[PDB]
Write a protein that binds this ligand. Structure first.
Ligand SMILES: CCCCCCCCCCCCCCCCCC(=O)OC[C@H](COP(=O)([O-])OCC(O)COP(=O)([O-])OC[C@@H](COC(=O)CCCCCCCCCCCCCCCCC)OC(=O)CCCCCCCCCCCCCCCCC)OC(=O)CCCCCCCCCCCCCCCCC
Ligand SMILES: CCCCCCCCCCCCCCCCCC(=O)OC[C@H](COP(=O)([O-])OCC(O)COP(=O)([O-])OC[C@@H](COC(=O)CCCCCCCCCCCCCCCCC)OC(=O)CCCCCCCCCCCCCCCCC)OC(=O)CCCCCCCCCCCCCCCCC
Ligand SMILES: CC(C)=CCC/C(C)=C/CC/C(C)=C\CC/C(C)=C/CC/C(C)=C/CC/C(C)=C/CC/C(C)=C/CC/C(C)=C/CC/C(C)=C/CC1=C(C)C(=O)c2ccccc2C1=O
Ligand SMILES: CCCCCCCCCCCCCCCC(=O)O[C@H](COC(=O)CCCCCCC[C@@H](C)CCCCCCCCC)COP(=O)(O)O[C@H]1[C@H](O)[C@H](O)[C@@H](O)[C@@H](O)[C@@H]1O
Ligand code: HEC
Ligand code: HEC
Ligand SMILES: CCCCCCCCCCCCCCCC(=O)OC[C@H](C)OC(=O)CCCCCCCC[C@@H](C)CCCCCCCC
Ligand SMILES: CCCCCCCCCCCCCCCC(=O)OC[C@H](C)OC(=O)CCCCCCCC[C@@H](C)CCCCCCCC
Ligand SMILES: CCCCCCCCCCCCCC(=O)O[C@H](COC(=O)CCCCCCCCCCC)COP(=O)(O)O
Ligand SMILES: CCCCCCCCCCCCCC(=O)O[C@H](COC(=O)CCCCCCCCCCC)COP(=O)(O)O
Ligand SMILES: CCCCCCCCCCCCCCCC(=O)O
Ligand SMILES: CCCCCCCCCCCCCCCC(=O)O
Ligand SMILES: CCCCCCCCCCCCC
Ligand code: FES
Ligand SMILES: [Ca+2]
Ligand SMILES: [Cu+2]
Ligand SMILES: [Cu+2]
Ligand SMILES: [Mg+2]
Lengths: 153, 54, 54, 108, 325, 153, 54, 63, 49, 54, 21, 54, 232
């Protein structure tokens, strides 16, 4: 991933992998892997920020170690009505929701700066494996997607 | 800032401001439009005078 | 002055030109237009504009 | 409306340095100022003293083509609204003067 | 021949003293024209004032005057004479106009140095095309055109892929431009300085990369538009001066609307001694890797523009009036 | 309205990997600075030193230190004025050619590869004859040969 | 003579991918327009939430 | 004559205030505000002069 | 409208101007103002009657 | 995306918001029975009511 | 009115490096 | 206004207006648009009544 | 080549020097540094007629190109000599690939198996900013993702190789060569294929089908009703 790029990632567990050094053209994992891509709250957008921009980021309390150097991973599901917020602007560092026009700041832990969304985008902790692969270091702190009655402690 | 007296004058004197009770209020108007009422009828003329000069 | 090329070499596309066509535009289209408004206001409306404000 | 632009130009020129305007939005401020006063004020004030007084000065009941006369007013208004719509675009209005000097005023 | 001192200063209305015989002629013409204009204006205004102080409504009441006086409308002979007088005035003025304009527009001044001015958005670029053998590096007439750098432009005339819309030439045919060896290039943060000799006939060759600009030197009391493809537009791209009489640094501005940074492409003229200029040319000719500032330092001049400063490019700065570099 | 003093075009940056130092009133600039590390463990530094100092003084670069160990330069001549020192690994420097028109110097660099992580940030430090410039630079893989690179899978 | 709802251009539903605009039918636009112009007015009570959509 | 002199003095003091105010605020945004101040002052002065020059040669009578 | 997520004030200045115009209008509508007739005579104008 | 919007509108209702969503869709969105409840409401339930009212 | 838990924190900088030589 | 602002993304792109400006037009227009519509419509209705009486 | 840089810098010394600098280091508020952008970023910006910028605004526009193909490549050669990044994609010969980058398995026409995969890739990353079939979409504040009809295949490749303004950069490691070619296949297939049934109303969707009916469709039927019925 080059600096100022965004990529959608999905929760691929260890035993559903078929690619890599140990690939047998016999194992069938397509049906399982389709479950992760089709999960309501599974999609996560992984942003690599420029090194100049990563020094201007303000982290939320309790989510300061959730980044790997220049990689930040936010939940892709909008905190308004659960549309996928995927319009990542490379220079303004805002993520725009196509559905209703919410702008989430990428340098302010996903805090909205326009539109009907009121709560910031949840952040996923990430790290790198011993083999050299990007992995999830933990679960989200908070429920994903739109709000509901009995949501926020 | 000239616009201020001008706008106030036009707005105020449109509704209020002295009634003209004469055909030609400037006195010595010398063109056909000073031969009608102020304002003129819909069709500009309730009569025409004899035109012999400018 | 602008109509002579020896003089218009230095004066073209300067603020001397800007000053010129504001004496002629603001001259005709503003002074004479306002004159026309004060002149014809009784004719157009049947009322007279304030002299002091004018 | 055209004056409000001349004052903004004139305020910026008070002292050296760009206090509140930029080059782009200063350039599109005299383009539109010089336009709305020749074509939206000047010419549209010539035909008003003409439309009012000329029938009254020759002894006419009406103009020759009254219904065409009413069209001349409405097309001018539409043109005026159209040219000022430039300010409602993010980039702004035209910024080339009131003269469209070429090739400054082309696709490129 | 300006009229007197302080009065002559008043008549100029901030007209620069002028550093060129052309400028001197134009200045004199301007002063005299203003003398006549002031007279005419005074007469016209005088009549407008007497209309207030002499011909009044109840001014003409003390004398038992009534209303409606004279009522004259046609003084025929006065009308004819007051038609003729402006005709005579404009004709005698036009004679001097055409007399004066011939000096500047003449192209037979036998220049001893030619400069290729190239205006682009948004700066200037000067190059010494020809220099007379007198004030030349070795003595042989300097010939400043680049062999392969110009021939590369001459080859831009046709698009290798089919694209010759404009009279069977490429849309982007940059061949009217002239590329030289000794070139001063103006950056957004370095004002281009064109070094010229004193008491020498200079020629200027004007062209534009993209859009119409204007080479204006207030001290020259002269400007000229530089047009892309000046030949097609049928505009004379060349003007000459007899000599420059003064020595020092003189501003120059772009006096033609050309996009955004129009107010921000200023150049300087550094007029230096004859010998000094020759030395300058020698140094910059034998040192093609050197810079204009270094060459200026070589001849004991200030390395940078003194009459102008670069603008600070930061938009949200300059709010406090600090717009210089 | 979008053409004010703060615009969304003027404020844009290089859209490349690795940041820069010095803007206007700085004698020496560095542009596009990263720590390149080839897939198969070959390291180096990419940068470009521009000497734009108005008082012609001919800055020369003594050394480059990424974190703890120096970099093998190639006896580059001092940067005179309006010149440029383009440096990269030799493998990625054979793709481009030295111009004879301006004054641009191509220099190859190398490291010991102590253990830099892709996506991490490290404090590169340039030491010239007069002064030092310290900037955080990202660690990234060099750009691939465009249009030839398929997936193993 | 006219195309409506060209479903082949759009693919199968996927919760992770989306398009620009993505409006409902014309008769449903007023409801979707209501959601856009309503500001972020969430009420956070004690351990509860009223969304801004409410 | 009554209204006049009052307007002249008020305009004069405002204008003086503006002229003084320009000198502190060098080339800032507030220079524009000070320009507005002096413009208002000058406006009031000319208003006073105009009312002075109207009660000298009136063209309208109070019925 | 001034309470929500927006950092810009180019929309605040737009809200306050419109609100001011609306307030001015509603005050005019409430305290219905009237003016006097200008009982003057200009030049060769005749008094009413 | 329209269904996603609609489901997330319902789920956010103050009290009966998450209980209502599970009653309509038969669980989390998307669900197996959702397009069967939508189909029957569309071919029978609503057109019956509509035809009757018409 | 304001999100109860969305709160910025005070923090400056951190560093990282890979392993296995 | 609700319908247009529900689909102001397609309006913004095709007609070159700021999307934020569109949102604010929707927000403010829902207060000012109805008011102007009422005023104009009322006056025009009375105007049509007057033309009938003439 | 050397003459390429020579003539490539000459065009740059009279066009790209105001809002860029002499040593391509950038200006305060005029433009970034062109160091490391590559030979493929100059091609996209110059050839597509996007450069040079004429005024600062929300977003630079595509317009009429200022330079030809050869001139573009000369400027690109000069720029890449100041530290190179992404380069142009070539084919079997030293020619810029155009119709060859219309699918991985492209021979003489687009394979239907390439558009299927390219469609899903396109939908996943670029259906948001653009439309479903690359019709364009709006962004934050005066910005937008342009309609894709005007770009050739080399421009598409270089667009997602570099990241023009607010477009993210998609390196070859992220989206491989084959994936990029599939995306191009889908883009060029959806553009050049007429609608199976009807006159596709600019492919905008429910907003364009509702304007054709609610404003124009009903008007014709009103005119029919006004013709059959009476006015009294
Ligand atoms: C460039 C465009 C600039 C146009 C400037 C404006 C046009 C002024 C028209 C002058 C005609 C004078 C006149 O007699 O007016 C009659 C009449 C006014 O009626 P009235 O004031 O009640 O009294 C007039 C008579 O007493 C009673 O009239 P009448 O009913 O006894 O008969 C009059 C009428 C009876 O004749 C007809 O019924 C003619 C049928 C209509 C023509 C359809 C044209 C489309 O004949 C005419 O109007 C004169 C000749 C008609 C044909 C030529 C007129 C122009 C045609 C188009 C111009 C070029 C357009 C290029 C296309 C550009 C692409 C958009 O005016 C018209 O009928 C309008 C016709 C012209 C409109 C053209 C505007 C197009 C604007 C396009 C801009 C983009
Ligand atoms: C290529 C060919 C394409 C051209 C197509 C032309 C369409 C013709 C429509 C029939 C015109 C009806 C009529 O009497 O004139 C109405 C109208 C004036 O008549 P009127 O007596 O004042 O009507 C008032 C009365 O109440 C009298 O009306 P009524 O209340 O007694 O009812 C009669 C009924 C009669 O209408 C019907 O029967 C309704 C049938 C609808 C069924 C839906 C099936 C689809 O009309 C109406 O209800 C209202 C007017 C409907 C026509 C509105 C105009 C639509 C056409 C679009 C404007 C121009 C486009 C042409 C552009 C040129 C292309 C090359 O004239 C027009 O404006 C029609 C346009 C004139 C076109 C001539 C220029 C084109 C020639 C091209 C040469 C190159
Ligand atoms: C009394 C009198 C005569 C007059 C006074 C009027 C007055 C004050 C009345 C009282 C009003 C009142 C208290 C109303 C009740 C409000 C409540 C609690 C409503 C809840 C009802 C309910 C279940 C609503 C569902 C939510 C809706 C309608 C969402 C809209 C909506 C839907 C339904 C979509 O499907 C959709 C699809 C794709 C994009 C967008 C949308 C979208 O926005
Ligand atoms: C049927 C006829 C229809 C006629 C309707 C015509 C009325 C439309 C008015 C349009 C005004 C638009 C002006 C644009 C203003 C704009 O763009 O600002 C925006 C915020 O928009 C606003 O608040 C303006 C909203 C207020 C509009 C009020 C509209 C009410 C209408 C309905 C009533 C009036 C007309 C009545 C006519 C009725 C006719 C009968 C008489 C925010 O700027 P932003 O996108 O963030 O971008 C910048 C960065 O790029 C950059 O960095 C910069 O630094 C940033 O600061 C930022 O500005
Ligand atoms: C104001 C004048 C201006 C001129 C003239 C100009 N540029 Fe730029 N350039 C910009 C600005 C501003 C950007 C910011 C990004 C954008 O808007 O695309 C830019 C961006 C670029 C980029 C994208 C680099 C990146 O990845 O961030 C390239 C390549 C580029 N310019 C090359 C050129 C070339 C080649 C010319 C040739 C004449 C040129 N420019 C002339 C202002 C200008
Ligand atoms: C904002 C999010 C965004 C995403 C995600 C995105 N783009 Fe873009 N795209 C843009 C913007 C903004 C521009 C205009 C930049 C410019 O022209 O300076 C653009 C420009 C382009 C251009 C140049 C357009 C033209 O008409 O010449 C092409 C081609 C393009 N994109 C294709 C793609 C492809 C192919 C993908 C993904 C597989 C993609 N885009 C993903 C926003 C996006
Ligand atoms: C159709 C009538 C609609 C009028 C649109 C006029 C906007 C033309 C574009 C100007 C612009 O570009 O705005 C962005 C700019 C950078 O910021 C500002 O202007 C600061 C806000 C101050 C403007 C007060 C608003 C006046 C309200 C009017 C409705 C009152 C009329 C009496
Ligand atoms: C009366 C007066 C209405 C004025 C608004 C007052 C909005 C102030 C927002 C301040 C805020 O942010 O506090 C947070 C809190 C969380 O906000 C709220 O609780 C307010 C929610 C109410 C929204 C109802 C909107 C319904 C519209 C209908 C009335 C229109 C039908 C026609
Ligand atoms: C009502 C008109 C009043 C006329 C006042 C005339 C004042 C100008 C004096 C002329 C001095 C000539 C000096 C000279 O040779 O300079 C030359 C010519 O000067 C002029 O342009 C004078 C033109 C004056 C306007 C024409 C009005 C004449 C009215 C007819 C009555 C004679 C210029 O000097 P130069 O060539 O640069 O060396
Ligand atoms: C019912 C409300 C309808 C709205 C109509 C719109 C017109 C609003 C214009 C308000 C004008 C005020 C009328 C007025 O005062 O005129 C008259 C006084 O004259 C002036 O205003 C001249 C001064 C103008 C220039 C100097 C300004 C210096 C102060 C600095 C201000 C920043 C009012 O007195 P009057 O009773 O009409 O004789
Ligand atoms: C309606 C006319 C308003 C004049 C002011 C415009 C200045 C802002 C420029 C934009 O951009
Ligand atoms: C106008 C109504 C404002 C409502 C504010 C109520 C605040 C509740 C506590 C928090 O959350
Ligand atoms: C909920 C609708 C109430 C209608 C109120 C009418 C107010 C409009 C008046 C605006 C025009 C001023 C005369
Ligand atoms: S769903 Fe993302 S803002 Fe409405
Ligand atoms: Ca200023
Ligand atoms: Cu210029
Ligand atoms: Cu210029
Ligand atoms: Mg000119």
């Amino acid at each position: 991933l080059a600096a100022a790029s965004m990529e959608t990632v999905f929760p691929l567990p260890a035993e559903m992998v078929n690619d890599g050094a140990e690939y047998d053209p016999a194992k069938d994992v397509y049906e399982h892997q389709m479950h992760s891509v089709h999960g309501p709250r599974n999609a996560v957008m992984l942003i690599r920020l420029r090194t100049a921009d990563a020094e201007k980021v303000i982290e939320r309390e309790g989510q300061e170690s959730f980044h790997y150097g220049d990689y930040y991973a936010y939940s892709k599901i909008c905190t308004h009505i659960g549309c996928p917020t995927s319009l990542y602007e490379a220079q303004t560092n805002r993520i725009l929701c196509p559905c209703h026009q919410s702008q989430f700041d990428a340098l302010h832990y996903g805090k909205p700066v326009f539109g009907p969304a009121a709560r910031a985008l949840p952040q996923l902790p990430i790290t790198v494996d011993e083999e050299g692969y990007l992995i999830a270091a933990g679960n989200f702190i908070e429920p994903l997607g739109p709000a509901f009655w009995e949501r926020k402690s | 800032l000239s616009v201020i007296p001008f706008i106030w004058n036009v707005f105020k004197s449109w509704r209020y401001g002295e009634l003209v009770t004469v055909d030609d209020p400037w006195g010595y108007g010398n063109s056909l439009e000073w031969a009608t009422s102020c304002p003129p009828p819909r069709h500009n003329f309730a009569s025409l005078p004899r035109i012999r000069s400018e | 002055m602008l109509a002579s090329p020896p003089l218009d070499f230095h004066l073209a596309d300067s603020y001397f030109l800007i000053a010129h066509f504001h004496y002629t535009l603001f001259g005709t289209v503003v002074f004479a237009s306002c004159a026309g408004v004060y002149f014809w206001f009784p004719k157009m409306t049947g009322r007279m504009m304030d002299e002091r404000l004018g | 409306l055209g004056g409000l632009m001349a004052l903004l130009i004139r305020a910026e020129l008070f002292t050296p340095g760009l206090q509140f305007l930029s080059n782009e939005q200063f350039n599109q401020l005299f383009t539109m100022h010089g336009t709305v006063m020749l074509l939206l004020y000047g010419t549209p004030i010539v035909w008003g003293f003409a439309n009012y007084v000329l029938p009254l000065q020759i002894g006419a009941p009406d103009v020759a083509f009254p219904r065409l006369n009413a069209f001349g007013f409405w097309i001018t208004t539409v043109g005026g609204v159209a040219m000022l719509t430039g300010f409602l675009t993010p980039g702004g209005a035209a910024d080339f003067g009131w003269t469209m000097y070429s090739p400054l005023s082309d696709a490129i | 021949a300006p009229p007197g001192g302080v009065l002559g200063d008043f008549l100029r209305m901030g007209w620069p003293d002028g550093i060129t015989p052309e400028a001197v002629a134009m200045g004199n013409f301007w002063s005299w024209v203003w003398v006549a204009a002031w007279i005419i204006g005074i007469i016209m205004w005088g009549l407008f004032l007497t209309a207030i102080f002499a011909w009044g409504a109840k001014r003409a009441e003390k004398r038992g005057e009534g209303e409606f006086p004279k009522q004259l409308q046609y003084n025929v002979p006065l009308e004819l004479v007051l038609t003729i007088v402006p005709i005579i005035i404009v004709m005698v003025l036009f004679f001097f106009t055409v007399q004066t304009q011939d000096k500047v527009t003449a192209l037979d001044k036998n220049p001893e140095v030619t400069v290729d001015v190239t205006a682009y958005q948004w700066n200037w670029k000067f190059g010494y095309s020809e220099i007379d053998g007198s004030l030349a590096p070795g003595g042989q007439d300097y010939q400043g055109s680049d062999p392969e750098r110009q021939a590369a432009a001459e080859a831009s005339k046709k698009d290798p892929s089919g694209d010759n819309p404009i009279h069977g030439n490429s849309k982007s045919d940059v061949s009217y431009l002239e590329f030289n060896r000794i070139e001063t290039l103006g950056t957004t943060d370095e004002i281009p300085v064109m070094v010229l000799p004193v008491n020498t006939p200079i020629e200027f060759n004007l062209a534009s990369a993209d859009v119409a600009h204007s080479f204006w030197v207030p001290e020259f009391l002269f400007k000229r538009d530089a047009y892309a493809h000046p030949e097609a537009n049928k505009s004379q791209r060349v003007f000459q001066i007899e000599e420059i009489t003064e020595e020092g640094a003189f501003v120059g501005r772009c006096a033609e609307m050309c996009g955004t940074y129009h107010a921000m492409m200023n150049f300087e003229l550094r007029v230096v001694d004859r010998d000094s200029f020759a030395e300058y040319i020698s140094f910059r000719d034998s040192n093609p890797d050197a810079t204009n500032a270094q060459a200026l330092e070589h001849i004991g001049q200030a390395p940078y523009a003194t009459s102008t400063s670069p603008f600070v490019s930061d938009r949200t700065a300059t709010r406090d009036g600090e717009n210089t570099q | 309205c979008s053409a004010g003093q703060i615009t969304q075009t003027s404020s844009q940056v290089a859209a490349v990997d690795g940041n820069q130092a010095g803007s206007a009133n700085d004698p020496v600039l560095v542009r596009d600075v990263t720590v390149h590390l080839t897939t198969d463990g070959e390291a180096g530094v990419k940068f470009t030193a521009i000497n734009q100092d108005t008082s012609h003084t001919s800055h020369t670069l003594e050394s480059v230190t990424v974190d703890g160990e120096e970099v093998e330069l190639d006896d580059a001549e001092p940067i005179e004025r309006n010149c440029s020192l383009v440096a990269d690994i030799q493998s990625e420097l054979d793709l481009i050619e030295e111009p004879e028109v301006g004054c641009i110097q191509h220099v190859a660099t190398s490291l010991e590869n102590p253990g830099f992580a892709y996506g991490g940030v490290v404090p590169v430090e340039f030491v010239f004859d007069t002064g030092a410039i310290t900037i955080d630079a990202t660690v990234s893989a060099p750009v691939l040969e465009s249009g030839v690179e398929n997936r193993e899978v | 003579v006219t195309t409506i709802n060209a479903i082949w251009n759009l693919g199968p539903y996927n919760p992770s991918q989306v398009s620009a605009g993505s409006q409902p039918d014309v008769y449903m636009l007023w409801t979707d327009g209501a959601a856009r112009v309503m500001p972020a007015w969430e009420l956070y009570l004690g351990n509860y939430t009223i969304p801004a959509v409410f | 004559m009554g209204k006049s002199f009052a307007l002249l003095v008020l305009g004069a003091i405002i204008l003086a205030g503006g002229v003084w105010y320009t000198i502190e605020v060098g080339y800032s945004v507030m220079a524009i505000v000070a320009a507005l101040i002096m413009a208002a002052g000058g406006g009031i002065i000319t208003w006073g002069l105009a009312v002075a020059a109207d009660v000298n040669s009136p063209t309208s009578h109070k019925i | 409208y001034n309470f929500g997520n927006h950092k810009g004030h180019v929309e605040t200045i737009w809200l306050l101007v419109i609100t001011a115009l609306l307030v001015i209008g509603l005050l005019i509508h409430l305290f219905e103002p009237k003016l006097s007739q200008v009982r003057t005579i200009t030049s060769r104008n005749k008094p009413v009657g | 995306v329209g269904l996603r919007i609609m489901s997330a509108i319902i789920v956010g209702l103050p009290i009966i918001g998450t209980w209502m969503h599970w009653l309509i869709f038969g669980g989390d969105f998307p669900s197996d029975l959702m397009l069967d409840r939508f189909y029957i409401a569309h071919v029978l339930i609503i057109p019956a009511i509509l035809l009757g009212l018409i | 009115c304001x999100x109860x838990x969305x709160x910025x924190x005070x923090x400056x900088x951190x560093x990282x490096x890979x392993x296995x030589x | 206004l609700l319908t247009v602002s529900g689909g102001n993304d397609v309006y913004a792109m095709q007609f070159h207006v700021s999307l934020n400006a569109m949102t604010w037009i929707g927000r403010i227009g829902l207060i000012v648009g109805p008011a102007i519509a009422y005023f104009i419509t009322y006056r025009l209705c009375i105007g049509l009544q007057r033309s009938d009486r003439e | 080549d050397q003459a390429l840089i020579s003539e490539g810098k000459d065009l740059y010394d009279v066009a790209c020097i105001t809002c860029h600098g002499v040593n391509l280091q950038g200006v305060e508020d005029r433009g970034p540094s062109l160091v490391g952008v590559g030979e493929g970023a100059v091609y996209f910006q110059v050839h597509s007629g996007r450069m040079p910028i004429l005024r600062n605004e929300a977003q630079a526009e595509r317009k009429a190109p200022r330079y030809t193909e050869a001139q573009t490549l000369a400027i690109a050669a000069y720029v890449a000599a100041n530290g190179g990044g992404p380069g142009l994609v070539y084919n079997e010969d030293g020619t810029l690939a155009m119709e060859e980058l219309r699918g991985e398995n492209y021979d003489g026409q687009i394979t239907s198996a390439d558009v299927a995969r390219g469609g899903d890739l396109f939908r996943l990353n670029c259906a948001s900013c653009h439309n479903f079939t690359g019709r364009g979409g709006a962004l934050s504040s005066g910005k937008y993702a342009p309609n894709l009809d005007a770009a050739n295949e080399q421009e598409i490749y270089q667009a997602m190789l570099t990241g023009p303004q607010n477009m993210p950069k998609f390196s070859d490691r992220q989206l491989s060569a084959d994936e990029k070619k599939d995306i191009i296949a889908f883009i060029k297939s959806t553009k050049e294929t007429p609608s199976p049934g009807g006159y596709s109303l600019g492919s905008l969707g429910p907003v364009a089908e509702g304007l054709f009916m609610w404003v124009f469709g009903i008007l014709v039927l009103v005119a029919a009703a006004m013709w059959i019925g009476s006015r009294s």
